[PDB]
Design a protein around this ligand. Structure first.
Ligand code: HEM
Ligand code: HEM
Ligand code: HEM
Ligand SMILES: [Ca+2]
Ligand SMILES: [Ca+2]
Ligand SMILES: [Ca+2]
Ligand SMILES: [Ca+2]
Ligand SMILES: [Ca+2]
Lengths: 319, 672, 674
């Protein structure tokens, strides 16, 4: 495991406090066998204080999600387009960690809600951690970051009664969509089968934004990231997704875990569309606008390398 | 009220920052119209910083829940049994807040998971806030608070992959239950219909622990709190609860919200069993043991007052998410007992609020404030909302003329520990032998359920244990179930392909106790708020007419009526596409719609008939008003809970009796 | 002012935070000599609160003190700024001000040598507006990204955390000498401005150029200058050091006492106003925070009066919890592209999350505005509001489109000055217009009097002499030499190194008004100044003399302390607790002469040391009664000395002595380098 140095083994040994004092943790210290519990019982307090403070705030969005470790392998030396070290040689390998998620629901909400999905990838490169924080849909609802709380407030549950969980099917969301028409593109994606993928492994990842690749000589090109699934594209049907949300809220996280355990770790080709700085307004829309895709007929994909997830975490909370 | 002062009205006006400067919040400040965003855009950063920090840690348990405000009213002057001020006069009213919850699931998990449920009540009394932090089940899984993290770790999702959500149906939970047999009594309650209540309004509340009532003369008696529902007792069936968890994760919070909004706020009689201190060990078990009930046959309930919930929150986060209950919120006239589960809870709630609030000043949040003056020397801390005038906050002082004054049994209506209480013995980490019978009361509970209820409980166990991967855990489970009931172990073992151990009769008996059965509790005392789905069609004007006529009649009786058709229009509430049997307590098909029950792009194939068939299978009253329909559905015309009438008025009469009966249990198969 | 939030505990029984009457003096125990019980919620609620009382100190300006007041506009300033608080003659706005040192932790001494903070909040009818300034008009560095470098270097060395509240160590002078931008602020800090007599005797400066913006969109460039009405005054170093030990609270007590006696301090809130076209017209860049506009180039315009007249009720709740931000700006004001200011805008909003431990810090009483708040900010730890609008998003129809967007044209919105533009490459490059680090430090030095210049030289001699590294010391001389060869020579003499050869690239002879303390003439008022009368209980006539002097001095609003061997009616303080740092002038009544020429009641020679210290530190001193030579001879103070008084007549003594208190310091008692 990439994180072996931090692992703690409890397959043998006697219970200790956090400072290494052997202790017990099954009965409270009492004044007499039917008496009150004593303040001096440090075994009780350290155990319960830890429990009392186990929870942390869930993510403001993408709270419901699951992760795995893996490896990225470059298909070539990409110096011709980028100085990026992790892309600088054929077969060069970099560890990754990926987290997939729904977007609107809290922790515990169902995997198979109709929603945009998060697809976040960390490359632990030899020149620093590089993250591509993506979604399964290539365009976003809004054109300016300042509007994010408006979008999210409208889609999340109504704030008087906190209803409904993990769903756009309520007045406030459709009010926002209808008053803020930039939302139409992502809305159509979310209303298609892309809103209910068969699994994390059967969906693609997109950076959404135009980024730049920069060479060591300072020249740059405009790029879009596209993680193309090697398992194929597949969706649920809506009635099926609803039933699954009840019968197995953990469906996508279980599907990922299981695939990895059986030696069927999922793969994506990591790709970019690459265009010149001069094409920023050439395609009939602005490349600065995250509500637009570059049609593949205008700019084809280049395969940069292989992303493979093949190791489940050891402790979900910690990782 | 501390809340009215903090209500903020945004129905008019121009947008401002948090410091009152009018601003806009729709476009970022940029270096040119297609340029980068500027660091000096303080409008952007304040808005996004607030968004970035909206979330707070969910509660460690009972994370999923819903709250409402109301009033408690005392039936009498109870000075004869307690010094408690909120109970000191006939008709004395005290404002309350109640939050109900599941127990294991995270904050976005489904209301209709099978679980113990929380039922926490705050009384904002004229002598301080008093909380009773209870559950819908009267006994708890474990006998010492130090074991709480073990229980909770075992029932919550496995910590490598965080699977499964809001469910005991996995190896670790059953490993814990089978290795810690104290768990059996609460386990049998959770595996009964009490694990899947029809609503928060149709369950009771229990303080679980024995507490004390203490009089102003210092004498004390032992008490158990029981909040008895005036709506009656009702459960879902398991398959229904499963479907509901997917179709409407908000089912219980919506049910509560809607009942309050329609002026049908739920009610409970706040009751106690009261017994003498000399009876701590007189009933065949120890009253300090939280895994035991006192049978009502040994100690009847005394009704103290009425609890009614009648007003929904204004802001969920500020009120329901932020309410911080404590069993340490106690008032004069109440005291603790030496129940080692209760003893340790006292520490936990004060501590965990530091985690949720991020600061020590959580009692200053409006929902947590008392309704009387606060006089003490607590100072500073992050989020300090007070400006204290007393500049000598120490006791003893002369510089503030010796104020505040100490309050105790004698002076200032002080809280005081029941003066009869003593301790004697060694300082020990030992369990009392009086706690050792883990199986008799679970059997008592089992014996007290009706045959079909017993079958439902066996089937819940067959479902969950069949999902346990470890053969050794499954055997260990059978060992414990067998000590409660050989027959239970046999019947569960049958579904999982194991043999039950031989009968071990040490704890078997045939005693029963009143008031624990749901099925046995008789028809509901009110059908107000109950949901009727009328399945109709837009293809036939007769169908829409029958539905309209049925509607006005059922609505007058306080039923919530939904007319379902292919598409929305005048008179139609819901489409077949969004409708499900879990949305209704009874289902009626109108004659004119017969043809749909025999394909459409407007709904899934067979949807109309599946709604009727699911409703029947799940034991709900069903009917045809105006059969081809009963035959398509395989529903017997002579069945109890099946209605067939031409006369709208006769139909309504019969169907309303069926809603009160609630479930027709003769539709469920029993073991041979 | 914050009346709505006050809690009175002058009566009543102790309760928990939830209003249950309780006790809090004895723990609940299993028997009279038994262990304490976990069920004791009285104990745990009280100790938990105590355990959590402390919050992180501010990252800089940790040590400080605040008061409430009023700002009153002198005019309708509509013709230069849309700012609502300046829109009518006589318009009043509540304020809160906090003053501070800069480097020291909480509990470090007020009289450290340092930059001082001077932060002012105007609770305007269009939102809270903060000017977060210093008592020195220029800052050490030209880019916000360098602040942690500066602060790490000035703060204690991080292996042992030494020294507290002081630039007198290797790392600080290493930074100063490697980052020459620091020279201007350095010279200010090494002058008497680094050791102000009180918060009331220093000025406040915004430092950065900001903009005034009219409703029509036109703007001008401004610098804020809060000019003290009490006058300018400093301590001498060797007094500041003793005072750090005798009274770490000297400045906060001075301020608190002045407000309580009805002498609340006042400043004229002023601006220099210049056209946008003048950004580079004065021989430097107005975006550079290491530069002043000489008053000869742009005169001060008085906008209004700031008066502090009310002390806080609870220090923690008010002074400790006040959270200032330069991002608390109002319509009519705007930022400039000063790269130091630019980064500050990020820092203050971020750091309050650290102090408050949650995002709702604007809801603390001291931080709340005095006008309604209408926005869609929600939840977050510690959320006090209960929002009625259940559709907190824009655009909406379900709340009828409220709140409405405010901007230049609607709802009196803030707006960025519409004439502002940017052009060029996206760069991490310093403007060459920022490159002159030395001419202004020299302008400052040239503007001080001869004795003032010596004091600055001596401050540098003191500090640099404590730098262990020979390389750092040489580097420091290299930089000082670029400002002034004479400074470098004089400093070098103390540290046994050779100054390098004169390098006149930046030398010049120009001077500027308003920066000298010594040159700012006698104090405009002597109210609040402290007179210690040394007396004795051994002679009833010494006490009589002390009482007559007191009556005559208190008439003119001086704060009088009578000092004797022991307390009694008419005596305020014993010799044991008295010190010269406690007084602005010292008088000995001739009846007490014998004390000046051993006791278990005070340290040996204490009465004389008070008199000698006060003399040596430049204060007015004297003997009242006619017999002065025994005292003056013992003290070695010349009777003919300037600021040395000797009269038999109490009236005549006081008249002369009060002139000396206004002169404040007698600078002829300090030696000068030849
Ligand atoms: C192109 C549009 C966007 C995409 C594809 C995107 C993607 C994501 C993803 C995948 C995560 C979860 C990462 C994980 O698994 O831990 C995330 C979290 C987050 N996002 Fe973004 N996001 C976008 C826009 C925004 C905007 C405009 C904002 C705010 C201005 C924002 C604020 C956040 C916050 C506050 C979190 C929680 C982060 C954490 O706690 O670590 N998102 N988003
Ligand atoms: C008689 C058995 C128990 C019952 C009936 C009970 C009841 C409850 C209820 C109803 C809540 C949620 C209150 C709300 O709605 O906000 C709660 C929360 C909590 N409980 Fe208990 N509980 C019991 C045992 C324990 C034990 C033994 C411990 C720890 C030693 C414990 C620790 C907590 C913690 C940490 C929370 C979250 C509190 C908060 O964040 O405000 N529970 N419990
Ligand atoms: C012109 C130069 C500057 C002046 C006059 C200045 C002034 C001040 C003053 C007076 C305070 C204390 C306010 C109070 O009494 O609460 C303060 C605090 C602070 N300053 Fe600045 N400062 C300057 C530069 C900076 C820079 C460049 C940064 C960082 C980029 C910065 C970061 C801070 C932080 C983190 C605090 C603590 C703030 C708080 O906790 O509320 N300062 N500064
Ligand atoms: Ca809504
Ligand atoms: Ca498990
Ligand atoms: Ca049942
Ligand atoms: Ca150092
Ligand atoms: Ca914190």
């Amino acid at each position: 495991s990439p994180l072996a140095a931090y692992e703690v083994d409890d397959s043998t040994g006697y219970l200790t406090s956090d400072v290494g004092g052997p202790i017990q943790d099954q009965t409270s210290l009492k004044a007499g066998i039917r008496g009150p519990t004593l303040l001096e019982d440090f075994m009780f307090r350290q155990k319960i204080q830890h429990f009392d403070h186990e929870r942390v705030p869930e993510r403001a969005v993408h709270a419901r999600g699951a992760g795995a470790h893996g490896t990225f392998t470059s298909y070539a030396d990409w110096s011709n387009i980028t100085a990026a070290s992790f892309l600088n040689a054929t077969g060069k390998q970099t560890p990754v960690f990926v987290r997939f998620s729904t977007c609107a629901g809290s922790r515990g909400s169902a995997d198979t809600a109709r929603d945009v999905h998060g697809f976040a990838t960390r490359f632990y490169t030899d020149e620093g951690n590089f993250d591509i924080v993506g979604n399964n849909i290539p365009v976003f609802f809004i054109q300016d970051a300042i509007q994010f709380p408006d979008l999210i407030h409208s889609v999340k549950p109504r704030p008087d009664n906190e209803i409904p969980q993990a769903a756009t099917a309520h007045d406030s969301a459709w009010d926002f969509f209808s008053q803020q028409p930039s939302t139409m593109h992502t809305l159509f994606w979310a209303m298609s089968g892309h809103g209910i993928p068969r699994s994390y492994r059967h969906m693609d990842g997109f950076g959404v934004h135009t980024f730049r690749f920069v060479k060591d000589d300072g020249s740059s090109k405009l790029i879009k990231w596209h993680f193309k699934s090697r398992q194929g594209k597949a969706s649920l049907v809506w009635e099926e997704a609803q039933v699954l949300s009840g019968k197995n809220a953990d469906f996508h996280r279980q599907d990922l875990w299981d695939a990895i355990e059986s030696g069927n770790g999922p793969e994506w080709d990591v790709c970019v569309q690459i265009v010149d700085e001069s094409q920023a307004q050439a395609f009939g829309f602005d490349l600065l606008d995250p509500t637009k895709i570059i049609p593949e007929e205008y700019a084809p994909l280049t395969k940069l390398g292989l992303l493979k997830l093949d190791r489940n975490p050891t402790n979900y909370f910690a990782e | 009220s501390p809340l009215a002062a903090y209500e903020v009205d945004d129905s008019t006006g121009y947008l401002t920052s948090d410091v009152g400067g009018p601003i806009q919040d729709q476009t970022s400040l940029k270096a040119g119209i297609r340029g980068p965003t500027l660091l000096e855009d303080f409008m952007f950063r304040q808005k996004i910083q607030h968004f970035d920090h909206e979330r707070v840690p969910e509660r460690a348990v009972h994370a999923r829940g819903a709250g409402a405000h109301g009033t408690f009213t005392s039936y009498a002057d109870w000075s004869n049994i307690t010094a408690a001020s909120f109970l000191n006069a006939t008709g004395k009213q005290t404002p309350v807040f109640v939050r109900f919850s599941t127990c294991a699931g995270s904050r976005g998990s489904a209301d209709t998971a099978r679980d113990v449920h929380g039922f926490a009540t705050r009384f904002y009394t004229d002598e301080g806030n008093f909380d009773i932090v209870g559950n819908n089940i009267p006994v708890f899984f474990i006998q010492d608070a130090i074991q709480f993290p073990d229980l909770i770790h075992s029932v919550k999702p496995r910590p490598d992959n965080e699977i499964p959500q809001a469910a005991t149906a996995h190896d670790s939970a059953w490993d814990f239950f089978s290795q810690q047999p104290s768990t059996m009594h609460t386990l049998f309650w959770a595996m009964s219909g009490h694990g899947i209540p029809r609503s928060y309004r149709h369950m009771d509340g229990f303080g679980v622990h024995t507490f004390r009532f203490v009089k102003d003369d210092g004498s004390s008696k032992l008490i158990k709190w029981h909040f008895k529902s005036r709506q009656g007792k009702a459960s879902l069936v398991w398959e229904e609860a499963q479907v509901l968890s997917g179709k409407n994760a908000d089912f219980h919070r919506q049910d509560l919200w809607d009942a309050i909004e329609s002026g049908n706020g739920p009610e409970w009689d706040v009751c106690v069993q009261i017994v003498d201190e000399s009876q701590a060990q007189a009933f065949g078990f120890d009253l300090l043991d939280p895994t035991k009930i006192i049978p009502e046959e040994y100690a009847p309930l005394t009704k103290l007052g009425l609890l009614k919930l009648d007003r929904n929150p204004t802001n969920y986060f500020a009120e329901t998410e932020q309410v911080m209950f404590q069993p340490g919120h106690i008032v004069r006239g109440i005291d603790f007992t030496e129940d080692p589960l209760l003893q340790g809870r006292l520490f936990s709630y004060l501590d965990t609020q530091l985690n949720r609030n991020g600061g020590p000043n959580f009692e200053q949040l409006p929902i947590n404030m008392p309704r009387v003056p606060i006089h003490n020397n607590n100072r500073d801390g992050a989020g300090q909302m007070f400006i204290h005038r007393n500049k000598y906050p120490y006791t003893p002082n002369t510089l503030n003329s010796g104020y505040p004054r100490q309050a105790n049994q004698n002076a200032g209506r002080g809280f005081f520990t029941a003066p009869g209480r003593t301790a004697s013995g060694a300082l020990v980490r030992e369990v009392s032998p009086t706690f050792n019978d883990h199986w008799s009361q679970p059997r008592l509970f089992f014996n007290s359920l009706t045959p079909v209820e017993q079958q439902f409980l066996v089937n819940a166990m067959r479902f969950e244990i069949s999902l346990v991967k470890s053969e050794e855990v499954k055997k260990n489970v059978l060992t414990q179930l067998n000590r409660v009931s050989h027959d239970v172990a046999v019947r569960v073992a049958a579904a999982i392909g194991l043999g039950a151990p031989d009968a071990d009769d040490t704890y078997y008996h045939n005693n029963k106790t009143a008031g624990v059965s749901i099925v046995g509790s008789g028809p509901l005392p009110t059908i107000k708020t109950l949901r009727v789905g009328i399945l109709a069609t837009t293809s036939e004007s007769s169908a829409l007419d029958q539905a309209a006529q049925l509607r006005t009649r059922l609505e007058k009786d306080g039923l919530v009526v939904t007319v379902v058709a292919e598409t929305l229009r005048e008179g139609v509430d819901q489409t077949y596409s969004t409708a499900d049997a879990t949305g209704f307590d009874g289902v009626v098909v109108v004659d004119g719609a017969a043809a749909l029950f025999a394909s459409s792009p407007l709904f899934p194939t067979g949807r109309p008939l599946q709604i009727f068939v699911d409703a029947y299978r799940w034991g709900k009253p069903v009917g045809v008003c105006g059969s081809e329909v009963l035959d398509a559905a395989d529903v017997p015309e002579d069945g109890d809970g099946v209605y067939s009438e031409e006369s709208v008025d006769m139909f309504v009469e019969e169907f309303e009796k069926g809603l009160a009966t609630f479930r027709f249990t003769d539709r469920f198969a029993l073991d041979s």
